[PDB]
Subunit: 199 residues, 4 copies
């Protein structure tokens, strides 16, 4: 999947871009103990989290990403590389808090439910809209049409992962709070991966 | 008021230039029935709508305006002058649709509210940003920084128009749709004014009826 | 470079006019030893500092500049020209201190940082605001809108002097103290240059020499 | 106390202006249960909270205050007057968040302790600086000199309230967070008072 323009779509309200990025790497993001990732995650779980986190930062936050690349290259020791990563992740998470307020203000729904149904052929998805948007079928249709290209890519990614498998449904809550939690968990797992990668 | 750089600024998102041009001529543009200008506007109001329209076309599309002026000079009859005007006007309205699209893409806000408060001493302006920009202080600062030179001029103009008057507040809804409607209204009034100008009543001189 | 209105804008907070003037003359103003300028600077550098200093005085204090010009023309000897220059320079530095106090009182910021990024095509500028202005989007917008015409000119000058060179970043620390230090450095260099210009080697012509 | 120039002083870093306003009305602002003000405060404490909060709004945001008075005048029922007041309070508290960030950025100290010692004659005060300012005696002196006129008035107000009483020390923790909590508590007590006043 090509994430060019992804930042524009995200700010327009296509927040499931985050999910597409994570799922396209098959990264872990909804974690039981999202403070100790290495106690729950294997070496690809860590590697995949690192790659998904980096895609997310580069896509949503390209200037900070270039700065972070340079700062890490200039860092001389492993410990300094970890410290630099930690600082830039703090910056990235704060900036993401702002970006998520912007996207959920633009798209005028505070919380939605997304259900992905994977069955034998092509699957389907379903958005469960809040009561006020559900009362405006034509606003809700606008949101469906906005999310549709990303949701189609997400459906393809998931279907590739589930070939030959019994009927399965994946349920996401999409709100500022759950998306913040997903990105924080990705960041913590990515830090654990980087710690293993340097020194 | 200085309209140099106006095309570039408009493209960057300074869309209130349109308002400034209209208000500098005291032109009518938010018309109740914007389809028949003849019947709702006085001669001077039509007169001013035409002047504001010509300023807008020249400022935002100087090449098209030069062409239109030459083409009008070449037209010999009233009917040909009107048809030439309608042709260049359709061109200008299409180009302005494109320009509007670019400007609001560079603003990345769909709609804003602008309030101008006029009272006895110094007045002020107030931008009411949509919720997505209120959550983005850097965007709010950028939009205000782009708009502010134009808004200061607009405040000065209205400040002249309201001297000696009680506190009044003017509210502008700013979106691609309202600016398109304002410019369409200006174009319709300008066409009505031009028709009256090439008409026999005004275009035949005193010498032709021997005073 | 266009300096119309510069004095009023400076009082409103447009202090980077100083940088624009200095850079358009390629003058030295941030010197390691700002006490003996002739020990670090060539004759052409001293001359460029003199040209920049004169522009600055004329731009910000044109009445004072006319007075200084007349008194210099009336002075007959090198020594009197030096003395006249030193007197008017003290006056000018005194006014500049007052002007700077006013300008930074309007900015409501003690220090700002300006970064200019020059690359292959078009460069850019970036104003880095102090925390009290970062928390004030309205003030940040007012300052950007005021500074932008001067900054665009400064960017044009710098890109001209940097064609064909690798990516470069110029960082300006902007505060009452750094602007005072820059103007004081310009004044010292200009005095050294004027000393060389009014001496008989440069001042006396070939006719007096009897070629 | 004259609160002309108070807004200018506050923005310059003189945040104890808030304390002076509250204390000059003898208002409650450090509340045990700052969510239900009516359960701990007398009618007269409520009145003083309302008077202090309104002085604060008029001093720090006079345009919004003129608007709030006009909007209250236009509201016809008690319930609408309360709703208008709450809307404008939300506006004022958001504006105050921004103003407090400006004031503490100009102050160049993040958290301070102010101790006011009331004794028989004139009392005294003591500012306990954060460690980085304690190492810069000139910066500490600048902060002291900035706060001194306001602290002198505050000390006079407290000495009048404590005439003839044993030695007493009042401790204020001063930070963006404690000042925000104080103003929010005042606004909630003021709402309780207004509810009683219009019904």
């Amino acid at each position: 999947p090509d994430f060019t323009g992804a930042r524009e779509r995200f700010l327009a309200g296509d927040v499931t871009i985050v999910l597409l990025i994570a799922e396209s790497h098959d990264a872990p993001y909804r974690l039981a103990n999202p403070e100790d990732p290495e106690a729950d995650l294997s070496d690809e779980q860590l590697e995949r989290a690192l790659a998904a986190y980096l895609t997310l930062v580069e896509t949503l936050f390209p200037e900070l990403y270039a700065e972070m690349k340079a700062a890490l290259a200039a860092a001389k020791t492993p410990e300094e590389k970890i410290a630099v990563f930690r600082e830039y992740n703090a910056r990235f998470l704060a900036e993401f808090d702002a970006l998520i307020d912007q996207a959920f203000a633009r798209l005028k729904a505070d919380s939605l439910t997304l259900k992905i149904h994977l069955s034998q052929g092509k699957g389907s998805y379903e958005i469960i809209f809040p009561p006020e948007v559900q009362a405006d079928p034509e606003r809700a249709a606008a949101i469906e049409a906005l999310w549709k290209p990303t949701l189609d890519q997400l459906l393809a990614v998931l279907q590739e992962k589930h070939k030959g498998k019994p009927a399965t449904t994946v349920t996401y809550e999409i709100s500022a709070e759950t998306l913040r939690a997903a990105v924080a968990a990705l960041a913590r797992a990515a830090e654990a991966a980087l710690r293993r990668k340097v020194g």
